[PDB]
Design a protein around this nucleic acid. Structure first.
Ligand code: MG
Ligand code: ZN
Length: 516
RNA sequence: AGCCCAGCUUGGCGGGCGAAGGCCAAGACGGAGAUGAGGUG
DNA sequence: CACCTCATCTCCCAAATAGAC
DNA sequence: GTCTATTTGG
């Protein structure tokens, strides 16, 4: 029954962030910073105590940290504008973070908390309390205007998924445009709600249970984006029992048709969508194939890098012009202080010059126009420099997920390697350009998406020990030495004595080992 | 040529260059947080 | 000191209390 | 007296 899921809805791009939401984000950021400082003080005090059996001392110091955490609830929630759901969310995140840090230190790997700086991105939360002996928080309950959670979270127009899938995409997209009234904390003791105009693509099972929701705001290229994520407790799915066995193995051999990333071998024929056959290649028999990634991903990422370099060039030229003009002319006051050539010359970030241009948008001086001459163009190309990158990465991710789906649609047993990921990606990945491909390939992402699909769809997953498999030749079964002979493919064997493919032999070994 | 125009990816139609304006088709979809690395200024 | 990539691991609460009607 | 929003210890 316990299968948590998250459904996300995208707020309309024509929704300026209201002041209430901005203040909630600011308060959450301040709370996290204060918790970080308190934890750092606690860590230093524990170090000092150890620098002096002391468990009572440690226990006493820990309790004082607990009191300050409670006193933060008094400062931010009891006498502030923060919502008690946001505070609980941030406190839980901080507690989990410090627990993970302690676990890491126990092994011997050092770690520490790092401050951050507010930029406008953040998170607000809402928790749907369900006491014992209460009806479930089904989507029909949240869609009701006079329901229990009408002032906490209201998601109108829920249409049954069985009926939802029958509607055409036009009807599904036009009817999915709804408004969600979300509780947004307090304001001088005056509770505030926000009407998010959202677009919904999928709905929830009628038997779900909405545990909570959260609104996430992120700044991409200077433009705010908001997304509402709703968490529900879907009932579990019966695990599959019948289906072909598929073994998946990672690779990174460069190919003329893109970056080849994976090799899969199935014990029975698999059917692949015709929209993936250029990505998920399949041999004649349908039992083995290669997953390659297109070349457009690489071209787009290279174009983004070129854009970043051109931006650097333009910024350096503008810096030189600004320093020259400032030296040759007077300095109008900015930030209540005269402008100095030294400060401008040492500037690196485009943000400083963008802010200066905004301040001097209409100073009337010549350089102001020059400054605007840059600030316009920079704000365009910057968008490109990031947006295309995201799109490119998005494309790759989509492909991976699609591929994962097809496996869970047919496979009855999926096998994955274990030690052929980290160490192999560290050593045989083939340096700055060499390591660039692996970031663009990101085979670990494909592995993770496949694993997630198999877990969600009930497919059993078996992890095969890749130890002493790379050097193994399937046709002969002899361990060839590690003489970097595998820098290419195929590689001559030291057993039978013939060039054998390093990927097909590996996956056939995997299939043999699983069914033994 | 890019990026943007009711979630995301891919396409088609019609538009915008910081402002506009959306319409359709196919597919997939578990998010947040922190830490650790790799790099880049 | 600031930015980006990628890799791992957690987690997803509800009982008690006081109020507006 | 009944749903409801807030505080708080796991
Ligand atoms: Mg869009
Ligand atoms: Zn051999």
């Amino acid at each position: 029954m316990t299968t948590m899921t998250v459904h996300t809805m995208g707020v309309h791009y024509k929704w300026q962030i209201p002041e209430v939401l901005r203040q909630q984000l600011w308060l959450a950021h301040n709370l996290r910073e204060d918790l970080v400082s308190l934890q750092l003080a606690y860590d230093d005090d524990l170090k000092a105590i150890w620098s002096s059996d002391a468990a009572e001392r440690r226990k006493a110091r820990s309790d004082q940290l607990a009191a300050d955490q409670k006193a933060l609830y008094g400062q931010y929630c009891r006498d502030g504008d923060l919502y008690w759901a946001s505070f609980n969310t941030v406190l839980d995140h901080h507690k989990t973070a410090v627990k993970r840090i302690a676990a890491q230190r126990a092994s011997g790997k050092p770690a520490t908390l790092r401050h951050h700086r507010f930029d406008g991105s953040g998170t607000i939360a809402v928790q749907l309390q369900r006491q014992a002996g209460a009806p479930p928080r089904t989507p029909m309950v949240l869609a009701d205007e006079a329901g229990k959670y009408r002032n906490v979270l209201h998601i109108p127009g829920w249409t049954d998924p069985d009926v939802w899938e029958q509607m055409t995409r036009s009807q599904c997209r036009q009817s999915g445009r709804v408004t969600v009234r979300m509780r947004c904390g307090s304001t001088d003791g005056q509770p505030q709600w926000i009407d998010l105009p959202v677009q919904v693509h999928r709905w929830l099972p009628a038997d779900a249970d909405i545990t909570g929701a959260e609104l996430v705001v992120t700044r991409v290229a200077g433009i705010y984006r908001a997304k509402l994520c709703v968490t529900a407790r879907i009932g579990d799915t019966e695990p599959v029992t019948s289906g072909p066995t598929v073994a998946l193995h990672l690779g990174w051999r460069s190919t003329e048709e893109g970056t080849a990333v994976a090799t899969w071998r199935s014990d029975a024929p698999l059917d692949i969508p015709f929209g993936l056959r250029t990505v998920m290649r399949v041999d004649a028999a349908g039992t083995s194939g290669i997953i390659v990634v297109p070349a457009t991903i690489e071209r787009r990422l290279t174009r983004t890098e070129n854009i970043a370099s051109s931006r650097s060039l333009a910024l350096d030229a503008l810096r030189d012009k600004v320093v020259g003009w400032l030296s040759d002319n007077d300095a109008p006051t900015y930030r209540d202080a005269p402008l100095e050539a030294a400060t401008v010359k040492q500037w690196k970030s485009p943000q400083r010059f963008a802010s200066l241009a905004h301040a001097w948008k209409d100073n009337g001086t010549e350089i102001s126009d020059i400054l605007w001459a840059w600030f316009s163009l920079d704000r365009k190309q910057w968008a490109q420099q990031e947006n295309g990158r995201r799109k490119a990465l998005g494309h790759r991710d989509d492909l991976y997920r699609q591929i994962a789906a097809v496996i869970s649609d047919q496979a009855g047993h999926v096998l994955v390697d274990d030690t052929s990921v980290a160490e192999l990606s560290a050593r045989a990945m083939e340096q700055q350009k060499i390591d660039r491909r692996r970031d663009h390939a990101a085979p670990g992402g494909l592995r993770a998406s496949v694993v997630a699909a198999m877990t969600r769809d009930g497919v059993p997953v078996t992890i095969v020990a890749a130890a002493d498999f790379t050097r193994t030749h399937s046709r002969c079964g002899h361990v060839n030495p590690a003489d970097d002979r595998y820098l290419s493919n195929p590689v001559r064997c030291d057993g039978c004595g013939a060039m054998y493919d390093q990927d097909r032999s590996f996956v056939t070994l995997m299939l043999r080992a699983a069914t033994a």
